[PDB]
Structures are given as structure tokens and as C-alpha cells.
């Protein structure tokens, strides 16, 4: 069995900038979800080899995890907040697509997604 390479977190060809919205996404949103008791399955790519999930990367074609998001934010990989918000929504969506309702990992994603929603509701206006 083999894992795919992870999503890129560095690419000099990609336009990027610092925004106050991206600063919020690191200092408030990522920091809140990372420290949560349910963060740990989401803090690095799914290891489909060690978890014995040989179908995972047949069903999940756009993988994403908060380890990737954290490096993207710390490396200033994004152009705008919408790109980073899309990564969070991909991560949650992938968990719901692969798993079934009421599975423990779905309850964990739901608890993280509720905090995510509460924090991005107060995303600051761009300066």
C-alpha cells in the first residue's frame, strides 16, 4: 500500500501575500481548532497505509488536513482568506464523504467545524 505525496505547502510560482484576514485565520481560527481535544486526527495527512484504508485516496481525490493548512499559513502560501477557508471546508467535507453519520471521527469533525464557523463569522473586514 502507498500514500500519495502530501499537498504542497511551498511553491515560489504561486502568488501570495499577508492580509489581516489571513493573520486572523492563523492566530484565531487555526490556533483554536489545533488545541482542541479532537484536533489530533486532522493534524497531519491521513496515513492510509498505517490505518489500513486502501480505498481512502480512491474516494478522497482532494485531500486536506490542518498540518498542511498550518504550514501554508506559517509559510504565507495564500493570496487570500477564501483559499484558506476552502482548505478547511475541504478537510471537513472529506471526513463526511469517507465516513458515516455518528462515527466518532464525524462527531470530532462536527465539533471542530462548529468552532470554525463561530470564528469565521467574525473574520475582520480587509485592511
Q: Which of 9, 67, 98, 123 binds ligand RGW (CB under 6 A)?
A: 98
Q: Which of 104, 117, 118, 126 binds ligand RGW (CB under 6 A)?
A: 104
Sketch the per residue contact string, 54 through 93, with ligand RGW: x for CB under 6 A, - otherwise.
Answer: ----------------------------------------
Q: Which is nearer to ligand RGW, 14 or 40 (CB)?
A: 40
Q: Which is nearer to ligand RGW, 79 or 96 (CB)?
A: 96
The Cα 108–Cα 116 span in angstroms is 12
- Residue numbers at the binding site for ligand RGW (CB under 6 A): 41-42, 46, 51, 53, 95, 98-99, 103-105
Amino acid at each position: 500500500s502507498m500514500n500519495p505525496p502530501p499537498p504542497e505547502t511551498s511553491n515560489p510560482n504561486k502568488p501570495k501575500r499577508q492580509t489581516n484576514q489571513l493573520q486572523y485565520l492563523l492566530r484565531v481560527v487555526l490556533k483554536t481548532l489545533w488545541k482542541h481535544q479532537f484536533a489530533w486526527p486532522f493534524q497531519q495527512p491521513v496515513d492510509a497505509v498505517k490505518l489500513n484504508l486502501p480505498d481512502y485516496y480512491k474516494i478522497i481525490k482532494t485531500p486536506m488536513d490542518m498540518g498542511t493548512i498550518k504550514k501554508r499559513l506559517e509559510n504565507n502560501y495564500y493570496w487570500n482568506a477564501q483559499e484558506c477557508i476552502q482548505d478547511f471546508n475541504t478537510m471537513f467535507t472529506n471526513c463526511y464523504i469517507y465516513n458515516k453519520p455518528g462515527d466518532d471521527i464525524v462527531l470530532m469533525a462536527e465539533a471542530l467545524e462548529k468552532l470554525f464557523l463561530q470564528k469565521i463569522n467574525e473574520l475582520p473586514t480587509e485592511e
